[PDB]
């Protein structure tokens with residue numbers, strides 16, 4: 001299959017570089033942005049197969065960024081992109097809030113190639129590495 | 130004590146990943162985008178120390194993308210970002226067209242890690258790699 005086009009969103013530069021490097025080495029075409037504000041702007045510009053969205057970010061958090069994307073998708077009329085929460089905060093009540101905000105799934109930090117590969121396959125049908 | 134923040138722009142995924150990888154290994158915080166259109170929008174949004182701009186891209190080429198950035202900097206009233214052409218197409222007349230378009234300098238493909246560090250030091254005063 002063709003390489004998946006993936007967006008990674010994280011306010012922690014080390015966390016962002018880690019997920020971006022794992023996905024790029026698995027053969028994905030990766031865009032990486034440092035904020036929810038950037039996530040909205042780049043999802044308007046580019047068509048991604050899937051978005052990895054950090055939850056805790058200042059100003060606009062992951063849930064607010066996903067709501068912004070869902071509002072723009074409905075108003076602009078664009079096929080919805082799968083949004084996967086990728087966070088250190090994934091308790092039962094936090095999971096519920098993420099799905100309520102319009103996210104599709106969640107992974108817990110720290111990430112690994114196996115978790116990324118399986119979630120991309122589940123939601124896009126595209127394989128990695 | 131933050132590392133240099135660098136933008137790379139290239140419509141060829143393999144070319145883009147190569148320059149992105151070399152700059153990341155040198156210890157820069159690197160953003161990589163696939164078009165001139167993307168270059169304009171991300172330069173409005175984020176503060177880069179320097180941009181590496183591919184020339185040949187469909188719709189908006191690197192020269193048109195540099196002019197777009199320079200027009201936005203002037204109207205918005207923002208400190209200009211250095212823009213370095215990173216291209217396979219560097220004939221005498223092409224080099225002159227790049228400078229005419231508002232690009233500061235050029236490097237020829239295939240790129241090398243030493244030239245990249247030098248260009249960053251020249252245009253930003255920031256060091257990389259062992260001297261970061």
Ligand code: BEF
Nearest residue numbers: 054055056087088
């Ligand atoms: F800043 Be996070 F939700 F890992």
Ligand code: BEF
Nearest residue numbers: 183184185216217
């Ligand atoms: F598409 Be280029 F100017 F290497």
Ligand SMILES: [Mg+2]
Nearest residue numbers: 011054056057
């Ligand atoms: Mg965070």
Ligand SMILES: [Mg+2]
Nearest residue numbers: 140183185186
């Ligand atoms: Mg090109």
